[PDB]
Amino acid sequence: PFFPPLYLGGPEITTENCEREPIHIPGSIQPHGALLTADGHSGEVLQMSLNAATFLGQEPTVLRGQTLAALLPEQWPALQAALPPGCPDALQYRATLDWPAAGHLSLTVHRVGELLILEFEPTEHALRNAMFALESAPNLRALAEVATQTVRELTGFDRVMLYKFAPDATGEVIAEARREGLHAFLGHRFPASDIPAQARALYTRHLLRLTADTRAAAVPLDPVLNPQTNAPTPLGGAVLRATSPMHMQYLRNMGVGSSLSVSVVVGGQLWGLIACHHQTPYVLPPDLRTTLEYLGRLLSLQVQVKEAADVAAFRQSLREHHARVALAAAHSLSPHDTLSDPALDLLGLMRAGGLILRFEGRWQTLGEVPPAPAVDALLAWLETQPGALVQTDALGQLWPAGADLAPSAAGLLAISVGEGWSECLVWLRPELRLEVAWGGATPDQAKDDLGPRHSFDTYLEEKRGYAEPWHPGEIEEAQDLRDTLTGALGERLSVIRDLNRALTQS
Amino acid sequence: PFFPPLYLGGPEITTENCEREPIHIPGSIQPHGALLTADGHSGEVLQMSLNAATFLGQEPTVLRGQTLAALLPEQWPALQAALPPGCPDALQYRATLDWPGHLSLTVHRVGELLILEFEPTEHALRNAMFALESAPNLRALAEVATQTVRELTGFDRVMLYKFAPDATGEVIAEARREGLHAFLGHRFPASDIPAQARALYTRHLLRLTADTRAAAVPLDPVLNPQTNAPTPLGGAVLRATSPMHMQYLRNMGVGSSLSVSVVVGGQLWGLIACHHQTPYVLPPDLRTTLEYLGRLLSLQVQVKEAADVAAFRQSLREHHARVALAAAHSLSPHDTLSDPALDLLGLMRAGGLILRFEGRWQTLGEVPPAPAVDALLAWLETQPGALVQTDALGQLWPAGADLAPSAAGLLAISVGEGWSECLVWLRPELRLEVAWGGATPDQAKDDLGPRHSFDTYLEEKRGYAEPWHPGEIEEAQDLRDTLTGALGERLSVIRDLNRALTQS
Ligand SMILES: C=CC1=C(C)/C(=C/C2=[NH+]C(=C\c3[nH]c(/C=C4\NC(=O)[C@@H](C)\C4=C/C)c(C)c3CCC(=O)O)/C(CCC(=O)O)=C2C)NC1=O
Ligand SMILES: C=CC1=C(C)/C(=C/C2=[NH+]C(=C\c3[nH]c(/C=C4\NC(=O)[C@@H](C)\C4=C/C)c(C)c3CCC(=O)O)/C(CCC(=O)O)=C2C)NC1=O
C-alpha cells in the first residue's frame, strides 16, 4: 500500500518508508518537453504542463479551451484510429510535426482510461550489422560484451553496463564498456534496496526511462488533479515523467549528470537492465532512443538462446556417466545397493564431498559426512520442506541449528523420490573461503543513513559458511534422476503386493 | 544423402527423388545482381558471375586477377574486421557504395572464402512493434502481422502459414487484394516443403524469387579452385531457385515470391509467405525492415500462445483443485477416482474412461465392449513414453479401426512406468470435412511435376474425433504427477502390512 503524494497531503519519504512512495504519480515533468492531457472523446484539452505555452508558442488563454481537432488537424483522425477506447496503456503512437514557431516536433501519445496523454519533444545501417553480430555470439559473456560495445558506440555515453539480477533481487554487473581514465564497476554486486519492489513491477510494464538532468527542477501540471475523476493523473507510460527525488540524490553522490535504462524481459519476468551514465547533463534525441528500444527486444530473445546453449554444452561432458546411472536406477529393487557401488560413483556426477542415502527406513553414507546424531538433525529439517528439491549454497542461513556443521556440509542439493521425504538423496559440498566485492556497502549498511550512501569504492567482505555454488546444468541433471527413481517406484510396489499376496494366503 | 548437381554429373530430379536434390549448390544466380568469390586472406578474386563485368562496368580481363584492396579501398580493411577467420556462416556484413549509380554490398564468409553480393539501391516500424505487443490472442496477432506486411511491401497476397507436428501446414491468417481467390483455412501436404529445405530455413531466415520466368545466370569458373568442389550458396540471397519449385509457382500463377521464417526455441514454427502476380523486385533496404518484423514475431508468438493456455486453464480451476487433493491422499484409486461427485469425465470433455489399478479394470460412461478393452490395453503396454495422445486411433492402431463409435479419440497417462497402472479418456467418432488447398496427400505423388488445381477441395474423413486443446494435455500431465507422487505412501503402508504378515 502506497502513501498519498505530497500535493494531496502525505508523509515525507525516507529510507524506512521506501516501498510506499507513489513514483508513478509525481504530478510533474522533466523540463525538456511539454505535456497535454485531453478528453478521449470530445478532444477538449484538460491539463497543460506549465511550460507548454512557450514551447508550443501560444497564449495559454487559447490552449486551455480548444479541441485537438483544431491544433493537430492532420493527426486527430489518425490518432483516434490507432488508440480505440479500451486499449492497453502500454500501446503507444508516434508522429512528426512541422510546428512553425519551434521547428520540428516529435509527438508521442497513449491512452489511460477516458484520457489522452500527449508528449512533445524537439527533433531533426549499423543496427542491421549489430543484430547479426548478437546472433553469432558463442556464449553468454560473449553476448554481453557485444551489447555493451554496440550501445556505447551509438549513444556516445561515458559508461554502459549490463546489470543482471539474482533470484533474490541483488544485482551484479556482468559486462561493462567505459571511457579511459575512469573507475571500473565490473564484477561488483549491489543490494536489493537500490531498486525497490514496485519499481521492479513498473519496469516489467514500460521498458524505457531516463533522467536528462540530475540537477533539474521539476515542472508541475495545471490543474494538478484530473477534473474527470478528481484524482491525480497517472504518468507511468509518460517519458517526461519526473524522477523520484530520492534517486536523484543517489546519482548526485555517484557523480552522474544523466541516466538511461532499458529493461530486459525473459518469459514475463525482469531479467536485467542496460544502464548508462554520463558525467554531464545530456539529452538523447527521440529517434535514437527508438534504436535502443529495438536492441532491448533483440537481446530479450538472444538471452534465452545463449543460456539454453550453455547448459546443453556442460551436460554433454557428463554423458556416459549420466547414461549408465540412469540405466541402473531404472531396474533397482534395492536402491541401498545399486546406488552405493563406487563403480558407478554418484559423488563425481555432482562434484560433491559427501552423500546421504535414505531408502526403506534407514540411512547410509558415502565420502565425507557430518557426525551421526547431526545427520538425524538435517533429515528432520528436510521433512518440513515444501517441494521435491532443496538447493542451497549456504546452509547456516536457511537452517541456523546446522550452522556449526560447515566443515563437511556448507553446500546441499537434495531430491525426494516420491513425496514427503520418506526417501531422498543429499549431496554435500564443504566450506570454502569466500570474498564478495560489494560496490559501495553491504546490505546491512544501506539502511543506516536517512538518504543514499557516499562511498561507491571496491569493498571487501569475508563471508563464512559458504561453498562452491551449483552450476544450473547440475540441477537439471539431478531432476532427471529424481524422475527415474520416482518412475520405477511402481515396480517396487507391484512386487511387494505379490509377496503380500502369498503371506495373506498363509 | 544428396545426389551430385547437374554440372558435375547427376540424375534428373522428379517427384520420386525429391529429398536428394542439392538445392544449396545450384552454381547459378538470379539475374538482378552480381556475385564475386574471393580468397579470405590474400583478397584475390577467384569467381565471377557471368553478368558481373557489365553490372560493375569493367573489362573482365581486369576483374579476374585483382585484389579486393584495389576494388573497394575503403571497405577491405573494414571487411576483415567484421568477419574474422573461423566465424559462423550465418554472420553477415553490409555497406553502401558509390559506383559510377549506388550499390548495396553484402558479404559473408564460408571457410577460406568470401562471397560478395551486389544489388542496386537508392517511422511506421515503431508503431507496428508496439501494436504486436498489445494483441489479445494469437489469431489477433496473426491479423496485425498480415496487414502490416501488405502495407509496407505492397504485395498482392500476404499470409501466415503454420506447421503442424507432422509437417503439414495450415494458412491461419491472410490479407489480399480485392477480386482475388482466398487460401485462408486451407491445409497443404508435407510434400510441398521437403525436409532438407526445412533444415535450411532454420539456418538462414529469408529467401525470394524476383522472377518466376527468369533464366539463371551461371558462375565462372563453375568450381571453386581452392577445393576443386562446388561453391556453397546457402547464405547468398541471389542464389537461384530450385527448378522444381519454379514450375509450381507458374501453375499457381505467381510472378514473384518472398518468405521469412518464424523460429521458436530452435525450431521452425511457420512462414510469412508473399506472392505477386507480376515480376517485382523489392529494394534491399526494405527487406531489412521485414527481417526485424520476423524477429519481433518469433518472440511474440511465444507470449501469446502461453497466454491462450493460461486463460483456458483458469476456467477449470475449482474442478482441478478438488481433484488434485483427492488423488494425493488416495490409498485405493479404484474408489476415489470413480465417484461421479468428483467427475473425471467433465475435466477432459470425454465420452468414456478406462481406469486400471491393482491389477483389474473398471469403466465409466461410454466404452467399447469387454474383449476389445483388453485389445486396447495390450497395445498401450508396448508404447514408449508416459503419455499417448491421438485424435485418430484407427491410424496408429489398425486392429482397433472398428472401435470408432465409442473411441475415435484417446488420451492416456501412465502412473509410474510400464503401463501397469493408467487412465484412458475416450472421445467418440465425429463427422469431419477438411478443406485441402489443391489436392489430398495421396494425390501429390502421381504427377511427374507439381499439380494444376489449387481450388477448394473437400474430403470426408472417417475415424476422426474432436482434437485435444493443448491446455487439456497440460491438465493431464499434472494429474500424472500427483498420482505417481503419492505412490510412495502406497508402498510405505504395504510394507508395514507385509511386516505383520511376515511376523505371522
Ligand atoms: C551499478 C548499478 C546501479 C544500481 C544498483 C543502481 C540502482 C538503481 N536505482 C534505480 C531506481 C530507483 N531507486 C530508488 C530508490 C532508492 N535506491 C536507493 O539506493 C535508496 C536511497 C532508495 C530509496 C530509499 C527509486 C525510488 C528508484 C526509481 C526511480 C524512478 O523511476 O523514479 C535504478 C533505475 C533508474 C535508472 O536506470 O536511472 C537503478 C538502476 N544505480 C546504478 O547505476
Ligand atoms: C499456399 C501455400 C504455399 C505452399 C504450400 C507452397 C509451397 C512451398 N514450397 C516451398 C519450397 C520448395 N518446394 C520445393 C519442391 C516441391 N514443391 C512441390 O510442391 C513439389 C513439386 C516439390 C518437390 C517434389 C523445393 C525444392 C523448395 C525449396 C525452394 C528453394 O529454396 O530453392 C516454399 C518456400 C519457398 C518460397 O516461399 O518461395 C513454399 C511456401 N507455396 C505456397 O505459397
Author numbering:
A (entry chain B): 7 to 130, 138 to 519
B (entry chain A): 7 to 106, 109 to 130, 138 to 519
Lines quoted from the article behind this entry:
Homogeneous refinement of class 1 followed by local refinement implemented in cryoSPARC v3.1.0 gave a resolution of 3.6 Å, and local refinement with a mask over the PAS-GAF-PHY-neck region resulted from a resolution of 3.4 Å. The modeled structure shows the signatures expected for the Pr state, including the PHY tongue in a β-sheet conformation and the biliverdin in 15Z conformation. The structure of the PAS-GAF-PHY domains is almost identical to the crystal structure of the corresponding truncation of DrBphP. The cryo-EM structures presented here are free of these biases. They firmly confirm a head-to-head arrangement of the dimer for bacterial phytochromes and indicate that the bent conformation of the photosensory core module previously detected in Pr crystals is the one that is present in the solution.
